Design a protein around this ligand. Structure first.
Ligand SMILES: [Zn+2]
Ligand SMILES: [Zn+2]
Lengths: 185, 176
């Protein structure tokens, strides 16, 4: 099962499109892994669709339709890395530009717009990420295995939301090797 | 179907490359996408450009549209909101894996009908909302950061649409 979901407020910001790219990529990667949050967000989407339909139209310039119709095309990979993450990795998650850091962890800082940062984590076997406070909200999605930290167990597909008032030490659970996608602002 | 039955027009786009079908969707939704992006902070010239690009995607990706999971307005919106906002992102908003019905199976028409129902239901609901509540919702979608939850401050019937989507997605997975 998946028990750790995208929060309502991050769903609402996803729905709106008002999220920095780092925060969108984690959230959307959780949607590709979690049908629960797809439905959660797809209902938030219904709200904007409803908003749009009831928006008082603004006319486009004369000739706009025929101009679009002229250019119509008329009658014309790693199961750990789904959705929009496959874009940032390009086949094989084990193959990126890693930086070992260094009590058993390695990371890749993923290229994004916005002011929030996006990185892959790699926490092997029984290795613990050294304790990190947060310079903002933090988002963590497990792509392989599991890890123990906060108050809970997080497994493949689960999403951790960490605040600014949170000191924590993410230790990987034994067995598989824990690969994550994280997001900070 | 009708000049105004968007789901059927969308299947006409899809099954027959129906261009008169596309004229109907464009003429209705292009000025509405334009007006929407302008409430989102866009200037008229760029909102028109985007509306036009949205409607071009609608024709290109018409296959991706699943009426057991969305109304047309919603899907179109989806395309509108996932555009690049330059200060937020380097490209289109990261969107999840594409789950579409293949060039074969339609979704169960009964789901489609029940999806459009729950959907009309919620449109009917948004419409009758006090204006000071409709402004809390509009702000969510127009110009506001992450410290903002809408399924938790509004009391809109989002409950059956959700399960409708969950149930729709399950059928999709069973098929695919
Ligand atoms: Zn979820
Ligand atoms: Zn952390």
């Amino acid at each position: 099962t998946i028990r750790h979901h995208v929060s309502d407020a991050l769903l609402t910001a996803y729905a709106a499109g008002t999220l920095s790219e780092a925060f969108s990529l984690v959230v959307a990667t959780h949607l590709s892994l979690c049908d629960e949050c797809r439905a959660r967000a797809g209902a938030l989407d219904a709200v904007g669709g409803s908003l749009m339909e009831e928006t008082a139209p603004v006319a486009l310039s004369e000739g706009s339709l025929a101009s679009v119709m002229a250019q119509l095309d008329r009658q014309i990979a790693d199961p750990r890395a789904p959705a929009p993450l496959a874009d940032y990795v390009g086949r094989r998650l084990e193959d990126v530009r890693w930086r070992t850091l260094g009590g058993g962890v390695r990371q890749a800082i993923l290229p994004t717009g916005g002011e929030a940062i996006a990185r892959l984590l790699w926490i092997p076997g029984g290795q613990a990420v050294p304790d990190h406070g947060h310079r903002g909200l933090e988002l963590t999605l497990v792509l392989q295995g599991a890890f123990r930290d906060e108050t809970d167990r997080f497994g493949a597909g689960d999403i951790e939301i960490a605040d600014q008032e949170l000191e924590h030490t993410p230790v990987a659970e034994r067995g598989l090797d824990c690969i994550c996608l994280a997001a900070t602002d | 179907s009708d000049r105004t039955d968007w789901v059927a027009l969308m299947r006409a786009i899809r099954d027959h490359r129906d261009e008169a079908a596309f004229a109907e969707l464009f003429q209705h939704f292009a000025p509405k996408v334009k007006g929407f992006l302008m409430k989102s902070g866009s200037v008229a010239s760029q909102a028109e450009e985007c509306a036009q690009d949205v409607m071009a995607t609608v024709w290109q990706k018409a296959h991706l549209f699943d009426p057991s999971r969305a109304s047309v307005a919603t899907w179109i919106f989806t395309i509108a909101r996932n555009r690049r906002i330059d200060g937020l992102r380097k490209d289109r908003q990261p969107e999840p894996e594409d789950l579409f019905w293949g060039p074969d199976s339609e979704p169960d028409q009964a789901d489609v009908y029940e999806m459009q129902q729950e959907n009309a239901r919620l449109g009917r609901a948004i419409a009758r909302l006090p204006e000071a509540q409709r402004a809390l919702i509009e702000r969510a979608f127009f110009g506001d950061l992450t410290h903002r939850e809408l399924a938790a401050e509004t009391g809109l019937p989002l409950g059956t649409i959700k399960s409708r989507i969950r149930l729709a997605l399950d059928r999709l997975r069973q098929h695919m």
